[PDB]
mmCIF file of N, CA, C and O in Angstrom:
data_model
loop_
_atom_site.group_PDB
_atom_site.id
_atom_site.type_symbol
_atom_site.label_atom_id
_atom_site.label_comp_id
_atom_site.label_asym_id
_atom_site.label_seq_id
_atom_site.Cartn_x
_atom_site.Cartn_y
_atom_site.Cartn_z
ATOM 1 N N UNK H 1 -117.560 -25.600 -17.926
ATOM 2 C CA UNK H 1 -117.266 -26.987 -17.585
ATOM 3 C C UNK H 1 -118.232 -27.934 -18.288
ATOM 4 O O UNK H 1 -118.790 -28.822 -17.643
ATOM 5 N N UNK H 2 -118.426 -27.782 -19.490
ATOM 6 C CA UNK H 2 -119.222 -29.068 -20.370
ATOM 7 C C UNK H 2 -118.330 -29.944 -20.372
ATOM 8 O O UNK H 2 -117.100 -29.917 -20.386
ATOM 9 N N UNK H 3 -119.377 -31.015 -20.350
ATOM 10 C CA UNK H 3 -119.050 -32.794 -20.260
ATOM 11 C C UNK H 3 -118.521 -33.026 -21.999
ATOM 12 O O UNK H 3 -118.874 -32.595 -23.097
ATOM 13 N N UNK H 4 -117.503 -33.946 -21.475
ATOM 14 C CA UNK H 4 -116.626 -34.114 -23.016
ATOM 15 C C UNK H 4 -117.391 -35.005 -23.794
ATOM 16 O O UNK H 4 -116.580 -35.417 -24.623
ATOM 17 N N UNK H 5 -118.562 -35.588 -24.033
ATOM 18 C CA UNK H 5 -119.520 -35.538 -24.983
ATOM 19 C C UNK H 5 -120.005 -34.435 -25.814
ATOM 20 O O UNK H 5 -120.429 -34.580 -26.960
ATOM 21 N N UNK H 6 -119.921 -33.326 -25.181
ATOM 22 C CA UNK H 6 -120.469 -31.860 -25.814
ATOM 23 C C UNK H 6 -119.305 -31.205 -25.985
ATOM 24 O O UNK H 6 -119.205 -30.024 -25.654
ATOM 25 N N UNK H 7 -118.248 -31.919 -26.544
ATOM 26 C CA UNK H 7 -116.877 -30.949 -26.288
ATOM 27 C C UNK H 7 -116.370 -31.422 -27.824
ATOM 28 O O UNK H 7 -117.058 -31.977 -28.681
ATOM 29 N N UNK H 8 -114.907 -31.016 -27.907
ATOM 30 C CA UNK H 8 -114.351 -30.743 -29.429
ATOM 31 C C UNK H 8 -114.674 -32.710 -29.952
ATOM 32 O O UNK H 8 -115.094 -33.188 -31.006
ATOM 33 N N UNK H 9 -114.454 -33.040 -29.297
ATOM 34 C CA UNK H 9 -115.008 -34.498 -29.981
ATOM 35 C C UNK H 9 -116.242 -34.543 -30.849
ATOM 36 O O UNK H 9 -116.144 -35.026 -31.977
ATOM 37 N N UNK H 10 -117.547 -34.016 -30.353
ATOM 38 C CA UNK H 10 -118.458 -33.862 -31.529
ATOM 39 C C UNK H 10 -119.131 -32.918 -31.329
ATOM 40 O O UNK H 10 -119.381 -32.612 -32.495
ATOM 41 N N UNK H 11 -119.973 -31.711 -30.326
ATOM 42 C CA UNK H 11 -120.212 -30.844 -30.068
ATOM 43 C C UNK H 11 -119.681 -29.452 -30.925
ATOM 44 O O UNK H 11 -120.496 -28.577 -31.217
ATOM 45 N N UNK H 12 -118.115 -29.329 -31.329
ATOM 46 C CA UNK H 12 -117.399 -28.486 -31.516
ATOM 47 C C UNK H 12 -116.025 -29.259 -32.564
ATOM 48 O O UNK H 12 -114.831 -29.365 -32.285
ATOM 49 N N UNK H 13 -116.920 -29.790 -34.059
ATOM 50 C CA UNK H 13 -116.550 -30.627 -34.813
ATOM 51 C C UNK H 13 -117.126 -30.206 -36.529
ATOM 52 O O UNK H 13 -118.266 -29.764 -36.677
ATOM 53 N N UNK H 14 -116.462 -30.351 -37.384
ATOM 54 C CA UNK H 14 -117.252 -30.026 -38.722
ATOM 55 C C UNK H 14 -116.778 -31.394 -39.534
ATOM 56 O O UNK H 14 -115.685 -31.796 -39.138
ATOM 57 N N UNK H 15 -117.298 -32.087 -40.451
ATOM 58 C CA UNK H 15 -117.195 -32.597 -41.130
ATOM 59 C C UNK H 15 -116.852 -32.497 -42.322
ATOM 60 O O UNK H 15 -117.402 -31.694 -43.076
ATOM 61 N N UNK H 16 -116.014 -33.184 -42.648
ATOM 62 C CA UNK H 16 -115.302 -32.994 -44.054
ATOM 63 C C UNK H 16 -114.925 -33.666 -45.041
ATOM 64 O O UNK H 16 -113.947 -34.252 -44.576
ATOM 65 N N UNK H 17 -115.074 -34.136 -46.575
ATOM 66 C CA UNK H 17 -114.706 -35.434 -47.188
ATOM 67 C C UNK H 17 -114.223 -34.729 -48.563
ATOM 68 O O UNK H 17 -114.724 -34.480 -49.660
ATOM 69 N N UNK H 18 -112.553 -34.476 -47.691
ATOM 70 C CA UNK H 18 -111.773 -34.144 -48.574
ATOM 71 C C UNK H 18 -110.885 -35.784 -48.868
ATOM 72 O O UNK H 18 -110.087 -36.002 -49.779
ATOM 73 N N UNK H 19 -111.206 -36.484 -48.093
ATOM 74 C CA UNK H 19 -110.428 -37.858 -48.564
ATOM 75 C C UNK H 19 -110.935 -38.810 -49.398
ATOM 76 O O UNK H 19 -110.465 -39.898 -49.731
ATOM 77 N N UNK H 20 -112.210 -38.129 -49.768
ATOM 78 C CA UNK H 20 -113.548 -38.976 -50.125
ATOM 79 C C UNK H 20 -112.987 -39.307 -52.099
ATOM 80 O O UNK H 20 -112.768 -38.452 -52.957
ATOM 81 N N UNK H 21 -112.929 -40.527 -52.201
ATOM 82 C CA UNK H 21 -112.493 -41.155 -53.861
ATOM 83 C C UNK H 21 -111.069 -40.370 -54.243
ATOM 84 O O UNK H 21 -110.952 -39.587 -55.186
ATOM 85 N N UNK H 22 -110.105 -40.712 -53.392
ATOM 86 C CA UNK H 22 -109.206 -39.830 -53.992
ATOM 87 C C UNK H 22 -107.766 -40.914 -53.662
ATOM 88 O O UNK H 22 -106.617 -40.476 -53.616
ATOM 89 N N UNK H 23 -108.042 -42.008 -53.508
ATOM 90 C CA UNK H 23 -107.091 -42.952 -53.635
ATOM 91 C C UNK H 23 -107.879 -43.730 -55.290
ATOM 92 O O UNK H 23 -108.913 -44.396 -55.351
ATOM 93 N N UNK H 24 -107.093 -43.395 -56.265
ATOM 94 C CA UNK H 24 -107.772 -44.164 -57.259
ATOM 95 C C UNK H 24 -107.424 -45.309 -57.282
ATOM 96 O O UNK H 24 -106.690 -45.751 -56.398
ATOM 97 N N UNK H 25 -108.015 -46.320 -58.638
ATOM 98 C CA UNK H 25 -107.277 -47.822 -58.889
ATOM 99 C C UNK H 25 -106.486 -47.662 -60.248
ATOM 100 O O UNK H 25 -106.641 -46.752 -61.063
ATOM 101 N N UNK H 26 -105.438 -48.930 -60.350
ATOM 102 C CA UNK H 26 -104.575 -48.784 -61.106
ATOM 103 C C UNK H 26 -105.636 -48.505 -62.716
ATOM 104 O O UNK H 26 -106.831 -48.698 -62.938
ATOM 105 N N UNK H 27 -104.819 -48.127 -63.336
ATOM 106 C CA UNK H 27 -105.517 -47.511 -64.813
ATOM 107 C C UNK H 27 -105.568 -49.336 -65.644
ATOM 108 O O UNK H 27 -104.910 -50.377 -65.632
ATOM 109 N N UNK H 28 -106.641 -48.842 -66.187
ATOM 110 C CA UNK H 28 -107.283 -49.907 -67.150
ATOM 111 C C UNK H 28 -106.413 -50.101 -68.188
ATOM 112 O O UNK H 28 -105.908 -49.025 -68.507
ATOM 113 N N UNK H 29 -105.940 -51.216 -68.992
ATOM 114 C CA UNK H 29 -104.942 -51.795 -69.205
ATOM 115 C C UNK H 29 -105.447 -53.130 -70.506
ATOM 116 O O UNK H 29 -104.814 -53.081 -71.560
ATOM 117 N N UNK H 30 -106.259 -53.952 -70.408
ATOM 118 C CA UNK H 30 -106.976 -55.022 -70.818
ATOM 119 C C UNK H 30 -107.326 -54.484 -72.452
ATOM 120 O O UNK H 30 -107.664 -55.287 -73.322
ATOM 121 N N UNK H 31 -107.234 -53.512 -72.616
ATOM 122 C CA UNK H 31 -107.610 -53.064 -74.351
ATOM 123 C C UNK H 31 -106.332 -53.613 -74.863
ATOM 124 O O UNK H 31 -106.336 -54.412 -75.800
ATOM 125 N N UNK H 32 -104.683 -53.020 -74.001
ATOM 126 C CA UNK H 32 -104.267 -53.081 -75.045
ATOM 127 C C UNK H 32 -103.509 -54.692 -75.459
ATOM 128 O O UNK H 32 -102.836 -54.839 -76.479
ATOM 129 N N UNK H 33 -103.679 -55.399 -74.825
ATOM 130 C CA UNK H 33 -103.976 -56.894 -74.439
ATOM 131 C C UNK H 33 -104.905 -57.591 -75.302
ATOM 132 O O UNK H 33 -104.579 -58.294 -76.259
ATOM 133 N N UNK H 34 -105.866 -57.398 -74.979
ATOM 134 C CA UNK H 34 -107.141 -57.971 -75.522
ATOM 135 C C UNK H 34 -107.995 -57.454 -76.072
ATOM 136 O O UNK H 34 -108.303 -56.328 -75.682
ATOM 137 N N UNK H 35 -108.836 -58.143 -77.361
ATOM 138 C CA UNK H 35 -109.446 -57.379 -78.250
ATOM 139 C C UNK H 35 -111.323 -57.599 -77.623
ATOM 140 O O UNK H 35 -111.715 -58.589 -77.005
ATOM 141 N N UNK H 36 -112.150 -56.452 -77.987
ATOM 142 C CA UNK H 36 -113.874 -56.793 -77.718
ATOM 143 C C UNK H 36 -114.291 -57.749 -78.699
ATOM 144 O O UNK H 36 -113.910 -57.618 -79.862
ATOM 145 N N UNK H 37 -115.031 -58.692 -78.358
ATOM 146 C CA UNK H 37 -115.877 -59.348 -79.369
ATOM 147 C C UNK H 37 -117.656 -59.627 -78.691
ATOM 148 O O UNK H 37 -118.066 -60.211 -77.687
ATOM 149 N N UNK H 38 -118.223 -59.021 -79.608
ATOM 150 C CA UNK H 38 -119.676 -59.020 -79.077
ATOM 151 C C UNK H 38 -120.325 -60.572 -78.771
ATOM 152 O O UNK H 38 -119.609 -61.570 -78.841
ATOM 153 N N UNK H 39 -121.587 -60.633 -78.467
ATOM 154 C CA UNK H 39 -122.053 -61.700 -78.411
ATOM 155 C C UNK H 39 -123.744 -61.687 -78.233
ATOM 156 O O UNK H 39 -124.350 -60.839 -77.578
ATOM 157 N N UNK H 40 -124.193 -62.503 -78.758
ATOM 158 C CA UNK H 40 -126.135 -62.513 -78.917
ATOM 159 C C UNK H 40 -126.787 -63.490 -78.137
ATOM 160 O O UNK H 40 -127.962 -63.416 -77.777
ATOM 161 N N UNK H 41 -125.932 -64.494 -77.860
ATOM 162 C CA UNK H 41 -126.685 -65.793 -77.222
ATOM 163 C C UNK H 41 -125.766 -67.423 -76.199
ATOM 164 O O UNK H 41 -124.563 -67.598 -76.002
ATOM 165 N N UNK H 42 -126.213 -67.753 -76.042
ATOM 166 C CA UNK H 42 -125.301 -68.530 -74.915
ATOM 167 C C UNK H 42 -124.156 -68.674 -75.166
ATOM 168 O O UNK H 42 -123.498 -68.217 -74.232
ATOM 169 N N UNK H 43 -123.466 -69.118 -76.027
ATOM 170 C CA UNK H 43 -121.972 -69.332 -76.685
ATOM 171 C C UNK H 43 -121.604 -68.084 -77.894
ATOM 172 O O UNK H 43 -122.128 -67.049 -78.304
ATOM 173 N N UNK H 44 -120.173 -69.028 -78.202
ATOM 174 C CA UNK H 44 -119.788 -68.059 -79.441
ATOM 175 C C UNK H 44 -118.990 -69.435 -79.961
ATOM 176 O O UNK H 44 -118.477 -70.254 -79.199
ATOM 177 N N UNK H 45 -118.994 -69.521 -81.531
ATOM 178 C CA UNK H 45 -118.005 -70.552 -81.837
ATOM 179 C C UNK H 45 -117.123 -70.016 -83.061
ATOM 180 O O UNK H 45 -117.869 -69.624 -83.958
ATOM 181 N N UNK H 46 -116.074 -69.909 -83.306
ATOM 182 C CA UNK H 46 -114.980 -69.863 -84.300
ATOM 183 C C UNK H 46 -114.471 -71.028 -84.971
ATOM 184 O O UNK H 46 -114.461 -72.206 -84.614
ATOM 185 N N UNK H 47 -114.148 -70.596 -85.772
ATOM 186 C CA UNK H 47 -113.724 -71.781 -87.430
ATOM 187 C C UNK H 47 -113.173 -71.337 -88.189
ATOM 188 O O UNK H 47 -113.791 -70.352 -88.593
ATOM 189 N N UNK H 48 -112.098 -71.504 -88.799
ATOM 190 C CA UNK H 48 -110.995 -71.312 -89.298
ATOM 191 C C UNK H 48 -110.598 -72.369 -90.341
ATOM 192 O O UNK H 48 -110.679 -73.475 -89.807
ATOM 193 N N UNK H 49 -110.145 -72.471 -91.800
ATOM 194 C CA UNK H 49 -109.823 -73.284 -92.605
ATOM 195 C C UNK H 49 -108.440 -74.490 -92.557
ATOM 196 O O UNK H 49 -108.374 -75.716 -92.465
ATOM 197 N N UNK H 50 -107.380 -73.287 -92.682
ATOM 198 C CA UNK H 50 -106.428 -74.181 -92.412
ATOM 199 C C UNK H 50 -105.340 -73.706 -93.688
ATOM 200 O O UNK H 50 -104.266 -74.290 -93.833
ATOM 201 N N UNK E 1 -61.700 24.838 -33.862
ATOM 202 C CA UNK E 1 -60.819 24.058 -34.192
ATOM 203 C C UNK E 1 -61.093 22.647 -32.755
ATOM 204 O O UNK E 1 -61.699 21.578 -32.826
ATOM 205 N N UNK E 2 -60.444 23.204 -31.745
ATOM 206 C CA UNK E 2 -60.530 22.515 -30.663
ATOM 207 C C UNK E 2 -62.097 22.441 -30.188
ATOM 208 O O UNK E 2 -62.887 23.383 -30.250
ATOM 209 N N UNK E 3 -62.315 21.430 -29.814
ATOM 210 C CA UNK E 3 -64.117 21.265 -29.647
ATOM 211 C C UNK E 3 -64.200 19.581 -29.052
ATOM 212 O O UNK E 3 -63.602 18.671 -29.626
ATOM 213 N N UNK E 4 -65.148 19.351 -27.669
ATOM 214 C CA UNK E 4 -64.616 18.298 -27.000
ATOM 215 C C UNK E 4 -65.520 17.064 -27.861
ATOM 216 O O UNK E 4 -66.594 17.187 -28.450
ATOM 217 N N UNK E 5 -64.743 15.973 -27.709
ATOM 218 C CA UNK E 5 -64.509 14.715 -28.934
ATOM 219 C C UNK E 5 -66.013 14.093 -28.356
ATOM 220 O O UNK E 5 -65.875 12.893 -28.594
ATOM 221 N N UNK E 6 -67.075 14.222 -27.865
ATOM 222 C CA UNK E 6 -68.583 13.988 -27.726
ATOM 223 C C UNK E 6 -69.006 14.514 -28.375
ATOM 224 O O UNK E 6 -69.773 13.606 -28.696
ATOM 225 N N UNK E 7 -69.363 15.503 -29.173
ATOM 226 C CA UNK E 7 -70.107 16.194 -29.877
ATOM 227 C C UNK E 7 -69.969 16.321 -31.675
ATOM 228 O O UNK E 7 -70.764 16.011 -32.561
ATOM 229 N N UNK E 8 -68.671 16.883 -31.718
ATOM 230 C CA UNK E 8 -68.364 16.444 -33.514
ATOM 231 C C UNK E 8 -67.904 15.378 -33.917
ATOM 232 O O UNK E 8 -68.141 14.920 -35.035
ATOM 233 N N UNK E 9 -67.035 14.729 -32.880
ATOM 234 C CA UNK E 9 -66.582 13.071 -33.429
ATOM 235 C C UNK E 9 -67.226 12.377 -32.995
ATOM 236 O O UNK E 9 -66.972 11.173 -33.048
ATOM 237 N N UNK E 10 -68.519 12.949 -32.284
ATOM 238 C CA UNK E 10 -69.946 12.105 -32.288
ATOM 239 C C UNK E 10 -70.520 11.801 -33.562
ATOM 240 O O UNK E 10 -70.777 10.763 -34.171
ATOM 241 N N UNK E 11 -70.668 13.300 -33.826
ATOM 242 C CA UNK E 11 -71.852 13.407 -34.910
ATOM 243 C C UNK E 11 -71.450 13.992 -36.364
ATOM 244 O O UNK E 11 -72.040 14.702 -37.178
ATOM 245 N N UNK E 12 -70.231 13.399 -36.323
ATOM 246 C CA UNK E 12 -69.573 14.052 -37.719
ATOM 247 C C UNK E 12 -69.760 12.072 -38.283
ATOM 248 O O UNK E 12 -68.844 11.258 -38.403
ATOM 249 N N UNK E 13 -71.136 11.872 -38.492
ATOM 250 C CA UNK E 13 -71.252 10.811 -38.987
ATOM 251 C C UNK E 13 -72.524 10.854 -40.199
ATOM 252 O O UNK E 13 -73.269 11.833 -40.156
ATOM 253 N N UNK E 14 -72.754 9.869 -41.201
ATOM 254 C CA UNK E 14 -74.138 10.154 -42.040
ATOM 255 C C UNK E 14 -74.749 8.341 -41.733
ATOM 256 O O UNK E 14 -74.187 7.258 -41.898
ATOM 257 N N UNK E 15 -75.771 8.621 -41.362
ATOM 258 C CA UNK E 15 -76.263 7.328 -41.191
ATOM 259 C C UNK E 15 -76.878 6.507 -42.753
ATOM 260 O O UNK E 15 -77.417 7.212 -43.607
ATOM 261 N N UNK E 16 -76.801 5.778 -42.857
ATOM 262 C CA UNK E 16 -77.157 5.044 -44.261
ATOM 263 C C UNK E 16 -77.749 3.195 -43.369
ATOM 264 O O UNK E 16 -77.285 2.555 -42.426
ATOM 265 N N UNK E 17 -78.973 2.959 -44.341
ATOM 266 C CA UNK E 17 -79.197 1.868 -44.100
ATOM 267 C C UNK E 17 -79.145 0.955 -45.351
ATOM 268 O O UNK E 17 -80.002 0.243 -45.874
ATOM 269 N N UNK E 18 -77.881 1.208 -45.648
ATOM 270 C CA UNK E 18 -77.537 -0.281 -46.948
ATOM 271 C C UNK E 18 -78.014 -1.280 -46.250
ATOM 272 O O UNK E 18 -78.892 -2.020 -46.692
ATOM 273 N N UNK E 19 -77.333 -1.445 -44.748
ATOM 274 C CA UNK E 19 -77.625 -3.156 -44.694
ATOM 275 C C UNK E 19 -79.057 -3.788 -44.200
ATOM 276 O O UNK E 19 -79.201 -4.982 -43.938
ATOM 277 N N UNK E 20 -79.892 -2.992 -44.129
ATOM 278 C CA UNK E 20 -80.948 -3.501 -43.813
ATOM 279 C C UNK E 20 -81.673 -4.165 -45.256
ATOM 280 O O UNK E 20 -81.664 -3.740 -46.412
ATOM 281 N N UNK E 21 -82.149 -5.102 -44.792
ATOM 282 C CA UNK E 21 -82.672 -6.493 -45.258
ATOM 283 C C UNK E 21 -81.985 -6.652 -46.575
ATOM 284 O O UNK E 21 -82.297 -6.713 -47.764
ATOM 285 N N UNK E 22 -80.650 -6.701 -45.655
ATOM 286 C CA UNK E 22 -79.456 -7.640 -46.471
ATOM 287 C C UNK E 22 -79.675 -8.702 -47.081
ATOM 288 O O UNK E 22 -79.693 -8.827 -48.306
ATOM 289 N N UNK E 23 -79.927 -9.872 -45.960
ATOM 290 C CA UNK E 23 -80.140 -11.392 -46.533
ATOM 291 C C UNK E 23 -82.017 -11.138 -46.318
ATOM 292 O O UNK E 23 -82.676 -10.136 -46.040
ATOM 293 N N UNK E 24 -82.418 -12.659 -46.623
ATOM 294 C CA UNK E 24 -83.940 -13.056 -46.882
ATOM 295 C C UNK E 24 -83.658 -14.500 -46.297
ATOM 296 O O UNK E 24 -82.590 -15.044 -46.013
ATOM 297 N N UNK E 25 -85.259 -15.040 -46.192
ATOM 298 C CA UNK E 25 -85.506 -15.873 -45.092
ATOM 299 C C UNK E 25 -85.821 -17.306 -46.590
ATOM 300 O O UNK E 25 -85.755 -17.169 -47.812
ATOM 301 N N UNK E 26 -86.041 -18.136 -46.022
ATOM 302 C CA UNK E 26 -86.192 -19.713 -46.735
ATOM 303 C C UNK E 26 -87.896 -19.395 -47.687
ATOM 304 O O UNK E 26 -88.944 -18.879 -47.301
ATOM 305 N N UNK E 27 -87.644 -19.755 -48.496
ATOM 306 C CA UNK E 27 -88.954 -19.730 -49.435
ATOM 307 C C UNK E 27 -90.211 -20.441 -49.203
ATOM 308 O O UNK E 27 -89.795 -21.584 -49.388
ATOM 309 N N UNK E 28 -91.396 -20.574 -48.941
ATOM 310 C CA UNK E 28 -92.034 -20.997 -48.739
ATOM 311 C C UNK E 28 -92.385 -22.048 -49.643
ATOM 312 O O UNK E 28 -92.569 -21.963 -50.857
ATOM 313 N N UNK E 29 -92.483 -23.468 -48.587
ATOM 314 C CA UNK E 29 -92.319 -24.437 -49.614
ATOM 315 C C UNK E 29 -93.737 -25.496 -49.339
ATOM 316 O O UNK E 29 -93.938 -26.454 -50.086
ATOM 317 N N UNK E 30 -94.826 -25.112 -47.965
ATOM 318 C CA UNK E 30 -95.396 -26.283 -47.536
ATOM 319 C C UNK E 30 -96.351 -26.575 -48.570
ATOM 320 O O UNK E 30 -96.991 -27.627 -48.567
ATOM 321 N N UNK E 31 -96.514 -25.429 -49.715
ATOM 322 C CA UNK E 31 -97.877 -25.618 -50.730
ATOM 323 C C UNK E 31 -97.094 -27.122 -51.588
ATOM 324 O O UNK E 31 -97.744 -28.058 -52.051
ATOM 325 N N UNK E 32 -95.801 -27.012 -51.609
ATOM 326 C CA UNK E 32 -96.201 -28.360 -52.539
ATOM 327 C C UNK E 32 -96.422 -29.678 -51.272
ATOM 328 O O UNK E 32 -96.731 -30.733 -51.825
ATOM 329 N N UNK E 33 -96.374 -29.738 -50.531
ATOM 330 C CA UNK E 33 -96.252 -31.118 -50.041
ATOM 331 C C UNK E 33 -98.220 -30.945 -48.951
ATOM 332 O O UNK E 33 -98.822 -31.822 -48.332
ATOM 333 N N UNK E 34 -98.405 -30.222 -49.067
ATOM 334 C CA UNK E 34 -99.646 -30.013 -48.107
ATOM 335 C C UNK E 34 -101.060 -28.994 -48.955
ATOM 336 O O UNK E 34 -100.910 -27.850 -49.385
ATOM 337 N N UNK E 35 -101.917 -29.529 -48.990
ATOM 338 C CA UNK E 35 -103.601 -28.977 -49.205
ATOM 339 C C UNK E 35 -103.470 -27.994 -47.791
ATOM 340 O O UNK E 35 -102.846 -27.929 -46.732
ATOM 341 N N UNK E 36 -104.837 -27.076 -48.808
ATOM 342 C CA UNK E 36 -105.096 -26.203 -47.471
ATOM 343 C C UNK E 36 -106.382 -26.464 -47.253
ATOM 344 O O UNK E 36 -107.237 -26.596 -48.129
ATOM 345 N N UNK E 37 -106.525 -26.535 -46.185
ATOM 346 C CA UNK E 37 -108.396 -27.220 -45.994
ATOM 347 C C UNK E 37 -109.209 -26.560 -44.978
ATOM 348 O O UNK E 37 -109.474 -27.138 -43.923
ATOM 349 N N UNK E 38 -109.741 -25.032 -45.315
ATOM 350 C CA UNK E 38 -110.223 -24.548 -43.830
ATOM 351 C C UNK E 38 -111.171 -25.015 -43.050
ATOM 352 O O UNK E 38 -111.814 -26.031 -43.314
ATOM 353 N N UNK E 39 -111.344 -24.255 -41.948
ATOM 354 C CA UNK E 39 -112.056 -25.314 -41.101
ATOM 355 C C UNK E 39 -112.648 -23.457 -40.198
ATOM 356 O O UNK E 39 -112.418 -22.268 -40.422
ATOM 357 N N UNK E 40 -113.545 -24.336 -39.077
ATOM 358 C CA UNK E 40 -114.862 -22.941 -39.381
ATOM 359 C C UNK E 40 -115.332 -23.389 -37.566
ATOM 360 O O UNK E 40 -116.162 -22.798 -36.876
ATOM 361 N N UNK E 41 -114.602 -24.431 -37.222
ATOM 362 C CA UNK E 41 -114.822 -25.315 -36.015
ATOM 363 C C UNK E 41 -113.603 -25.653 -34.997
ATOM 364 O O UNK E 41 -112.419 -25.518 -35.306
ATOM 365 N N UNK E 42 -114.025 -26.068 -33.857
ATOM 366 C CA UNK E 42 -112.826 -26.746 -33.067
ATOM 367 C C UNK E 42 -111.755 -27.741 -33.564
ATOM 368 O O UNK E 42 -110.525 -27.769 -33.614
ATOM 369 N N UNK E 43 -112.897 -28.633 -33.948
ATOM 370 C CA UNK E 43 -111.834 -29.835 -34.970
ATOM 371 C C UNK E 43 -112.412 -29.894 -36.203
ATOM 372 O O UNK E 43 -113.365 -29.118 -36.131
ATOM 373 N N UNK E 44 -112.372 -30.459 -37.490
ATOM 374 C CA UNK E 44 -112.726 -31.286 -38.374
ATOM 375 C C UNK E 44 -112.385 -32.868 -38.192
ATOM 376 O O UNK E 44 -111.499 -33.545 -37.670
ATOM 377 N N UNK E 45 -113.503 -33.055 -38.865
ATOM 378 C CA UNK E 45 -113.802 -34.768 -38.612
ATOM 379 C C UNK E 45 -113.590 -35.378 -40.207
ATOM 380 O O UNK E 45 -113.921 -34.676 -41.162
ATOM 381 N N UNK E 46 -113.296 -36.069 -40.308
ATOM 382 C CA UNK E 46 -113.054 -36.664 -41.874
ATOM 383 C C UNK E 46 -113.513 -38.559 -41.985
ATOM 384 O O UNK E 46 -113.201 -39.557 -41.336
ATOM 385 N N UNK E 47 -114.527 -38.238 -43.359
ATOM 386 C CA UNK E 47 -114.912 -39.331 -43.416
ATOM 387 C C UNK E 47 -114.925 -39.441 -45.256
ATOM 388 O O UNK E 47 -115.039 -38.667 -46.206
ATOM 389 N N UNK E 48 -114.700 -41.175 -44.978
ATOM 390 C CA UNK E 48 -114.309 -41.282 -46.798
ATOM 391 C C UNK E 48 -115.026 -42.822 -47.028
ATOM 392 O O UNK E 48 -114.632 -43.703 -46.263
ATOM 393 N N UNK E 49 -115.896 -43.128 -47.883
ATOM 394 C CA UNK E 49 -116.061 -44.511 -48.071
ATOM 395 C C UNK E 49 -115.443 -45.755 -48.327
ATOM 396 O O UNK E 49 -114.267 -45.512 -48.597
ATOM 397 N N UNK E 50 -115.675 -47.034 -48.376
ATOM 398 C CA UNK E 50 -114.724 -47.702 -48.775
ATOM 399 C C UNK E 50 -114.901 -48.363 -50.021
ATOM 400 O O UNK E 50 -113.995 -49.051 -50.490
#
């Protein structure tokens, strides 16, 4: 007759993290969209002739 | 010739077991829809971050 504190609730319990990161996020996408352009310092400026 | 009908039209027979395990039972199917996850305890507890 143990008190249901000491019972299958946590007494008679194992832990497990089979759910653990296994909902992923949608797949990365933005490469084929958009191109990298580096950068060194506060801005960036472009110029073009015409 | 004459001989009473319990005894030779008993046993004027050959037993054969063709029909045993005639048909078969449903295929086991729960591996695709279900993990197997043993457990070593009363319950398992499951925890996953967010």
């Amino acid at each position: 007759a143990i008190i249901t504190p000491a019972l299958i609730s946590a007494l008679k319990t194992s832990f497990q993290k089979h759910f653990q990161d296994a909902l992923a996020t949608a797949p990365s996408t933005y490469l084929q969209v958009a191109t990298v352009i580096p950068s060194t310092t506060a801005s960036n400026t472009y110029g073009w002739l015409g």
